[PDB]
Design a protein that fits this description.
By secondary structure, the protein is of the alpha+beta class. The protein has a three-stranded antiparallel beta sheet with strand order 7-9-8. It is 38% helix and 26% strand. It has two domains: 122 residues, no CATH class; 91 residues, no CATH class. The chain is built from eight helices and nine strands. The protein binds magnesium ion (5 copies). One magnesium ion (MG) binds next to loops. The chain binds a DNA duplex through helix 4 and helix 8. Belongs to the initiator RepB protein family.
Length: 213
DNA sequence: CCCGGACCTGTGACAAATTGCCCTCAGACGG
DNA sequence: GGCCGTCTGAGGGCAATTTGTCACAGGTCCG
């Protein structure tokens, strides 16, 4: 029924810092690019509004501010760093935006891959929870279940979590619990976890999950 | 022995950021 | 033909929530 996103695992596991609105736009770019060699994409205000159930006004606000916050953002594949954009965005027509993605990023988008339908993620609010749901999809089985152990330091590096979450009680309270709650409340996935320890330090988080069925 | 100290946990406060809402007014189009 | 009524969207804002930071209470073990 709805668009099927696929992406190279290299993007799922890349290190970057994007907002919710920026990640939403990014899903459409990957969709446009894949359906084809030059990197120029386009976004319609009225289409964006309908996809994510926004008004035209608030859509316009989200696109405009997302777009100017890309400047200077960089992407690291573990390592190699790239800018997302190589030219400012611009609007030829009212309600229409044209963007220039770094053509050297194309092969990192299309490659060992991750896939999900866009309806699975479009109600998630916290961008770190989008990152977690993407990493879990990378390990999902056809039937809809999976289990994976992710290292905490790698979680911090890849999702570029803010500095105070290196204190484990803050990591638990403001990142782990919240994002597990959203996934359980906003996606068709049912997720559980347990902590792996070594001495006094907690080193990994072990995720198990199934599908509504 | 128990100390001060270096670790770990959780919670109460506050500061900074993001959310969906609300209102104005000109652009683009067709009847 | 050309004006105007309507559908858009580009601006300006808001209070209510969520996210990011740090002080302090309270556990263990070390030598
Ligand atoms: Mg952010
Ligand atoms: Mg917004
Ligand atoms: Mg005493
Ligand atoms: Mg007490
Ligand atoms: Mg004490």
């Amino acid at each position: 029924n709805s668009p099927r996103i696929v992406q190279s695992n290299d993007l799922t596991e890349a290190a970057y810092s994007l907002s919710r609105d920026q990640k939403r736009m990014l899903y459409l770019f990957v969709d446009q690019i894949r359906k084809s060699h030059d990197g120029i994409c386009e976004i319609h205000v009225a289409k964006y509004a309908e996809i994510f159930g926004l008004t035209s006004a608030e859509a316009s606000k989200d696109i405009r501010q997302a777009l100017k916050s890309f400047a200077g953002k960089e992407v690291v594949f573990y390592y190699e760093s790239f800018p997302w954009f190589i030219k400012p965005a611009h609007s030829p027509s009212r309600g229409l935006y044209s963007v220039h993605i770094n053509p050297y990023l194309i092969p990192f988008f299309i490659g060992r891959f991750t896939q999900f339908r866009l309806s699975e993620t479009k109600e998630i609010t916290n961008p770190y929870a989008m990152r977690l749901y993407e990493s879990l999809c990378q390990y999902r089985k056809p039937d809809g279940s999976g289990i994976v152990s992710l290292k905490i330091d790698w979680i911090i590096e890849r999702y570029q979590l803010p500095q105070s979450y290196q204190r484990m009680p803050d990591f638990r309270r403001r990142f782990l619990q919240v994002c597990v709650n959203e996934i359980n409340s906003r996606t068709p996935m049912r997720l559980s976890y347990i902590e792996k320890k070594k001495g006094r330090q907690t080193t990994h988080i072990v995720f198990s999950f199934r599908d509504i069925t």
